[PDB]
Amino acid sequence: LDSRLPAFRNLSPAARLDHIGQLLGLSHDDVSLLANAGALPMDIANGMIENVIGTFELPYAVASNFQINGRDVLVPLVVEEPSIVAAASYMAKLARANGGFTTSSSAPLMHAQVQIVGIQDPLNARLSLLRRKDEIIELANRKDQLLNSLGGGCRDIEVHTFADTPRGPMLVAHLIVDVRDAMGANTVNTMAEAVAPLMEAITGGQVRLRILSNLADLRLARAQVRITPQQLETAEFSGEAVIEGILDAYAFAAVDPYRAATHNKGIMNGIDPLIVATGNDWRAVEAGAHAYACRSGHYGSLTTWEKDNNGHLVGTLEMPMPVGLVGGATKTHPLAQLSLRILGVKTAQALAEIAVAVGLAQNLGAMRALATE
Amino acid sequence: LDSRLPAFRNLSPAARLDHIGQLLGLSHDDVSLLANAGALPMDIANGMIENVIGTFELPYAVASNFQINGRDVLVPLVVEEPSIVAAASYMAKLARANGGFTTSSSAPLMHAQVQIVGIQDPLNARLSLLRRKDEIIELANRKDQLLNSLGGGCRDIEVHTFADTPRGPMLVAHLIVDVRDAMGANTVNTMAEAVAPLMEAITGGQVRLRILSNLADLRLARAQVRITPQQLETAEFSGEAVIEGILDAYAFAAVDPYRAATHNKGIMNGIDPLIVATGNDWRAVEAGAHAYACRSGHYGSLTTWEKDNNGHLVGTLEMPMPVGLVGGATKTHPLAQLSLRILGVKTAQALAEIAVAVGLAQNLGAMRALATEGIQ
Ligand SMILES: C[C@@](O)(CCS)CC(=O)O
Ligand SMILES: C[C@@](O)(CCS)CC(=O)O
């Protein structure tokens, strides 16, 4: 695949679609899903959420130029705000000259929290749970034998205590679960329910909340980009000056939460539209992103920007990225399925890696604009 | 208006739309917007964002039972996830018995940041700016006198310094701007560009970034809700026990960021779909929400939950809520316009107040469900 698409921004929607269809070898019927309104039929919409009276459209666009680990990728995006798609495509174009985006990710690990109350000895109870961790993990896995056959499953437990809260002592167990190609909520919640009676028997306490954590800090996706001074030169500014300007902008975000919020918002401008396009839960991605940004006790920037030993601008984005190819609405929405086909992703972590690449590209575009104005 | 909508959940989408139309007295044109697919014309969609190849639908629903400061309101919501609309509606139903939701909000005040570098004396330059505050404010208000006449405009400036960063000393001025019915990005960005040469002249430094802050902590919206033990009783638990369970869940969110992230995610399950339904920018609302949640140096719960002196469960939500009735897709999307018609909102702050009421209801619904689920 070649993702460049010259003159794409100036073609009509119909011509853009026909071009995409030809590039990907989409069927006439697949193309029909975008060529005509109503790809989400009312019986599907009515079964997705409650009190439905119709559907609501946002534009469906494709960003060009993206290249991930040497392979060109076309990126569908659904959003209402101008400039996002153009900035994504243009920054991807610059990235291409220097090898594109380089990405990696952790295993798709999610936390299931099991909150325990009603015991006077939470610190002791924690050791009781750890002593019997194998038994707990085995019980969790008995509950989802298919997942284990697919290469996922409960891998570990960790246990945290809050001995002094205004509501008394609490213990919180985390199941650490490989969820393969799911976002993971229903998967881990089910395991949390399954282990609850055993945890009560072990601790002598009362289980309260059984629920995933959206602070998915064991499910990280990583992206790198490199830009040379030559690429950033303007009529007004030399490329070296622009790079220094960008580093100044980054330092500003790193110290001032008023700037970091806006800086990170820019990243999410790139990410959320891909989440929507793939039928994924954007609230979950947002919560993981912003909570991770303040894990140090200070709300800072999700990206980093530096100058390497060669004087080149180098950027990173590492953040939680819980997304699915299966589960939720990723299967139910015919256009979510088409998006996955366009992307060509075969695992959820592959989708996660594309997400962070697009987030990094958007942040680069935002700061290049702010540093050159 | 009566927002109770009996049996709404079980009616057909067509019958639901008819009942809404009757209640609001919607025109034929308005009803036809939702009855046929493709309400967003491709010409409009193509002008909204770049590289458009089609459109993407999400379900469009209406939450029932909401009441804001004694007035019933219907709430449109666009989202993919089940249980949200039902939970919102059911919690709103319970809220009604005790006076519904009570809301307030600050003026629609947004920050424009002006970053200045390369000053050898940033602390001194800060005082130079403050001495000439009125002069700066006057210049900011020069271009848009329509905004001033509508009761908006630059109200104040604050100046902050970061004298020791790895890239040298930085001075950051904030223009504090009343943006009336806009989210405010265009308004404040324009003012920030306008005052920049004057700030350079005063400080002797170089202006770099001129940009709104999404941490809109001067644009707060507030909601309150009250629920009695009687309303929360289940087959297994007394209402009193359920209230204690909810308070335990709240304390858990207040101490553990792994819980707080999920707890706040639930709030945003309520809010974001209303933001989408009104053509507004949900990334802006998300960033303001979560950054505000950590302002104290610990990422905590946006809501609060307490038991009052009568033993009633009382909840609050106060958070940044920058939204518009004008600008971009809010204007150009026919269904964003329909959503505003359904809501009946006359100011952006009124929309903000409904947003926090829905966020508060959603959090309550989530905690109630988690607190009442039996151990298997
Ligand atoms: C340009 C930006 O505000 C997003 C526009 S909605 C992000 C940033 O400031 O870095
Ligand atoms: C139930 C909840 O996870 C949202 C479902 S997406 C929120 C919460 O845990 O309070």
Q: Is B51 left (phi over 0), alpha (psi -120 to 50) or beta?
A: left
**Subunit contact A13:B257, Cβ cutoff 8 A:** no
Dihedral sign from CA coordinates of B184, B187, B193, B197:
negative
Contacts of B79 (CB under 8 A, 6+ apart): A49, B58, B59, B61, B85, B269, B272, B273, B276
Q: How far is the CA of B369 from the centre of ligand 2 (A)?
A: 9
Our CA-based measurement puts residue B319 at a distance from the nearest CA of chain A, in whole angstroms, of 14
How many residue contacts between A and B have a Cβ separation below 8 Å? 373
Map tokens 């540093």 to a residue: A371
In degrees, rounded to 5, the angle at the alpha carbon of residue B216 between the alpha carbons of residues B144 and B62 is: 95
Task: Dig out the tokens for B20 from the structure.
Answer: 């809404």
CA distance B287 to A271: 13
CA distance A349 to A343: 13
Q: Which of A19, A40, A56, A373 to mutate to test the interface with B (most CBs of B within 10 A)?
A: A56
Our CA-based measurement puts residue A102 at a distance from the nearest CA of chain B, in whole angstroms, of 24
Does domain A1-106+219-373 sit in CATH 3.90.770.10? yes
Q: Is A103 left (phi over 0), alpha (psi -120 to 50) or beta?
A: beta
CA distance A324 to A147: 14
Strands A109-117 and A102-105: unpaired
DSSP conformational letter for A11: S
**Resolution value, angstrom units:** 1.7
The residue whose C-alpha atom lies closest to atom 2 belonging to ligand 2 is B266
Our CA-based measurement puts residue B150 at a distance from the nearest CA of chain A, in whole angstroms, of 26
Q: What is the largest CA-CA distance in chain B?
A: 71
Long-range contacts, A132-136 (Cβ 8 Å, 24+): A132/A202, A133/A157, A135/A198, A136/A173, A136/A175, A136/A195, A136/A198, A136/A199, A136/A202
CA distance A215 to A285: 9
- Whether A264 and B294 have beta carbons less than 8 Å apart is answered as no
- Whether B115 and B172 have beta carbons less than 8 Å apart is answered as yes
Reference A34, options B367, B180, B56; nearest CA is B56
Strands A220-227 and A170-178: unpaired
The residue whose C-alpha atom lies closest to atom 5 belonging to ligand 1 is A266
- Whether A302 and A221 have beta carbons less than 8 Å apart is answered as no
Cross-strand pairs, B174: B113, B158
Per-position b or e across A141-158, b if 16+ CB within 10 A of its CB = bebbeebbeeebbbeebe
Contacts of A237 (CB under 8 A, 6+ apart): A245, A372
- Whether B252 and A172 have beta carbons less than 8 Å apart is answered as yes
Nearest-by-Cβ selection for B288 from A261, A298, A333: A261
Q: How far is the CA of B170 from the centre of ligand 1 (A)?
A: 20
Contacts of A135 (CB under 8 A, 6+ apart): A198
Which helix (H) or strand (E) segment is B72 a member of?
Answer: strand B71-72
Number of other residues whose CB lies within 10 A of the CB of residue B206:
14
Which helix (H) or strand (E) segment is A172 a member of?
Answer: strand A170-178
DSSP conformational letter for A6: T
Residue type at position A186: N
Residue type at position A108: P
- Substitution candidate for ligand 1 out of A265, A271, A303, A367 with most atoms within 8 A of CB: A265
> How many alpha carbons lie under 13 Å from residue A36 in its C-beta half-sphere?
12
Per-position b or e across B19-38, b if 16+ CB within 10 A of its CB = bbbebbebeeebbebbbebe
**Subunit contact B59:A60, Cβ cutoff 8 A:** no
- Whether B225 and B312 have beta carbons less than 8 Å apart is answered as no
Q: Which CATH number fits domain A109-218: 3.40.30.10, 3.20.20.80, 3.30.70.420, 1.10.10.10?
A: 3.30.70.420
Cross-strand pairs, B115: B172
The coordinates were experimentally obtained by X-ray
Q: Which of B43, B57, B209 to mutate to test the interface with A (most CBs of A within 10 A)?
A: B57
Kindly tell me the burial class for residue B345, based on how many C-beta atoms sit within 10 Å of its own C-beta (0-12, 13-18, 19 or more): buried
- Whether B37 and B335 have beta carbons less than 8 Å apart is answered as no
For the CA of A87, the nearest ligand: 1
- Whether B59 and B367 have beta carbons less than 8 Å apart is answered as no
- Whether B231 and B65 have beta carbons less than 8 Å apart is answered as no
- Whether A188 and A203 have beta carbons less than 8 Å apart is answered as no
Contacts of B141 (CB under 8 A, 6+ apart): B147, B148, B153, B154
Q: Which of B53, B214, B276 to mutate to test the interface with A (most CBs of A within 10 A)?
A: B53
Contacts of A244 (CB under 8 A, 6+ apart): none
- Substitution candidate for ligand 2 out of B84, B370, B372 with most atoms within 8 A of CB: B370
Contacts of A141 (CB under 8 A, 6+ apart): A147, A148, A153, A154
Residue type at position A32: S
Q: Is A184 left (phi over 0), alpha (psi -120 to 50) or beta?
A: left
Map tokens 């995409």 to a residue: A20
In degrees, rounded to 5, the angle at the alpha carbon of residue B178 between the alpha carbons of residues B316 and B201 is: 130
- Whether A351 and A182 have beta carbons less than 8 Å apart is answered as no
- Whether B210 and B117 have beta carbons less than 8 Å apart is answered as no
Residue B112, classed as helix, strand or coil, is strand
**What residues does each domain of chain B span?**
2-106+219-373, 109-218
- Whether A74 and B92 have beta carbons less than 8 Å apart is answered as no
Nearest-by-Cβ selection for B248 from A12, A54, A208: A208
Map tokens 């308070």 to a residue: B247
Query: What are the C-alpha distances in Å from A303 to residues A80, A220, A266, B63?
Result: 24, 13, 11, 38
Nearest-by-Cβ selection for B51 from A61, A245, A284: A61
**Subunit contact B247:A78, Cβ cutoff 8 A:** no
The residue whose C-alpha atom lies closest to atom 2 belonging to ligand 1 is A266
Fold of B2-106+219-373: 3.90.770
Q: Which residues line ligand 1 (CB under 6 A)?
A: A 262-263, 265-266, 269, 366; B 211
- Whether B139 and B112 have beta carbons less than 8 Å apart is answered as no
